Amino acid sequence: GPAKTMEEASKRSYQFWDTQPVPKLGEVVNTHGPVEPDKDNIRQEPYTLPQGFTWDALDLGDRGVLKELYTLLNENYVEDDDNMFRFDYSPEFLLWALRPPGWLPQWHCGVRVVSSRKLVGFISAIPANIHIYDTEKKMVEINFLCVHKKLRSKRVAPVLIREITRRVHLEGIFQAVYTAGVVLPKPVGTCRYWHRSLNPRKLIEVKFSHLSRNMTMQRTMKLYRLPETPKTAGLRPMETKDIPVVHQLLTRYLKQFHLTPVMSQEEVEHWFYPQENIIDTFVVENANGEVTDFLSFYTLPSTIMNKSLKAAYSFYNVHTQTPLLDLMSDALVLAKMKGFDVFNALDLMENKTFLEKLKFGIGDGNLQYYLYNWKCPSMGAEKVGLV
Amino acid sequence: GNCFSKPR
Ligand SMILES: CCCCCCCCCCCCCC(=O)SCCNC(=O)CCNC(=O)[C@H](O)C(C)(C)COP(=O)(O)OP(=O)(O)OC[C@H]1O[C@@H](n2cnc3c(N)ncnc32)[C@H](O)[C@@H]1OP(=O)(O)O
């Protein structure tokens, strides 16, 4: 079964990952480069699925197929430690995460039951240029690995990982980045999720959170209380004319970390140009008409296995003139103004400078960052600049 | 792929 701590993991044997070009769990890494020479010929045939299951590439432009994808994900995707909450991926959100610039339909890899055509499996790859230490390499970001609950523990996830690798090798890419809540060989960096309450009562009824030892409900609300309006001057939603400068600010600010994306202006528009109930981005235009900072957070509500828990996830926040503490404080205010219930943020990047000061509490979940077929020293959360 | 964390 899954393992959530490395202590838990170092006892486990990895029947699949020991066969993969990833550093072993105990191995200390001080080299820089791939684990495997690029393959000159790639298997033309799809891998063999267990009897009664077939490959199918999902055309998310077909609204019916996209409906099949979110229904699969909304019923069988990531859950919390206690099986109380499950992500509620909207169709318009998945198009955002699954059709960025450069997407390929054969990278929307799904598994269907042969007889019924019922979608029972999925995995995805989107292209991304990744800066890791001192190498800028083109990789894919693997996301949305999902085997239906009725098919679990039958070694169908390894087949999905192999088949998506094959389809990415065919396009000439040989590295990949991905995250996870479980420990596998081998985390290049471990990031903790932190949680800032915005509506304490909602998260206490639903049992997302709990009242601290000697603290009433009344005090808890007066504690997380926030201003009605933000305080940074010139804060406003990002517009079309801000795509160049948001690219500029993000391109530069990101260079101080060791694992970061490398975005074209077309990609910066896609990932940051606001879409309601998907992505939000606010820029800080100063008294001279210049844009100096921006904050961003994306929307991902969670079904409650017992309405929905509206969560805001901190995305990329770039500061040059506004103090990051004030920037992130206004982010909390804007999230509250928009009806969110909680503001989730990792401890990666400079987030540790404000997580305690802005009343974040620590979460019971770590997000391990992995690289496929790339052997490099691991880093701390503050060096991981990839959300 | 994400993970669902929540306050310790
Ligand atoms: C060149 C480009 C290459 C691109 C490829 C890059 C690699 C991408 C790598 C994947 C990027 C994922 C990115 C995301 O989206 S991480 C999100 C993962 N999704 C979920 O947790 C959703 C809920 N769970 C499920 O859908 C299933 O339980 C999954 C699919 C997780 C496996 O449920 P099942 O019980 O049916 O599994 P199995 O018995 O068939 O097979 C188990 C084998 O697979 C190992 N396993 C278990 N969990 C994960 C995991 N979360 N990531 C990678 N491997 C995992 C497991 O330890 C064992 O290996 P080993 O222990 O024997 O070694």
Deposited resolution, Å: 2.8
Question: Which residues lie closer than 8 Å to A274 by C-beta, 6 or more apart?
Answer: A237, A238, A280, A281
Residue nearest to atom 9 of ligand 1 (CA): A161
CA of A184 to the centre of ligand 1 (A): 9
In terms of Cα–Cα distance, which of A51, A159, A46, A189 is closest to A115?
Answer: A51
HSE at residue A231, side-chain half, CA atoms within 13 A, is 11
User: In the numeric block, which tokens belong to residue A366?
Assistant: 């770590």
Q: State how far the alpha carbon of A222 is from the alpha carbons of A199, A200, A216, A258, A304, in Å.
A: 11, 10, 10, 39, 26
Structural domains in chain A plus CATH codes: 1-387 (3.40.630.170)
A46 in reach of chain B (CB within 8 A): no
- Is B7–A87 a contact, with Cβ atoms under 8 angstroms apart? no
Quick one: DSSP state of residue A82?
T
Mapped to the 3 state alphabet, what secondary structure does A198-234 carry? CCHHHHHHCCCCCCCCCCCHHHHHHHCCCCCCCCCCC
Question: Which residues lie closer than 8 Å to A354 by C-beta, 6 or more apart?
Answer: A324, A325, A328, A329, A360
Q: How far from each other are the two terminal CA atoms of chain B, in whole angstroms?
A: 21
CA of A156 to the centre of ligand 1 (A): 9
Instruction: Evaluate the CA torsion angle A327, A329, A332, A336 in order and state its sign.
Output: negative
User: In the numeric block, which tokens belong to residue A283?
Assistant: 């820029």
Q: How was this structure determined?
A: X-ray
Question: Which residues lie closer than 8 Å to A33 by C-beta, 6 or more apart?
Answer: A135, A374, A375, A376
On whether the CB atoms of residues A128 and A171 are closer than 8 A, the answer is no
User: In the numeric block, which tokens belong to residue A90?
Assistant: 């909207």
Instruction: Kindly tell me the burial class for residue A250, based on how many C-beta atoms sit within 10 Å of its own C-beta (0-12, 13-18, 19 or more).
Output: buried
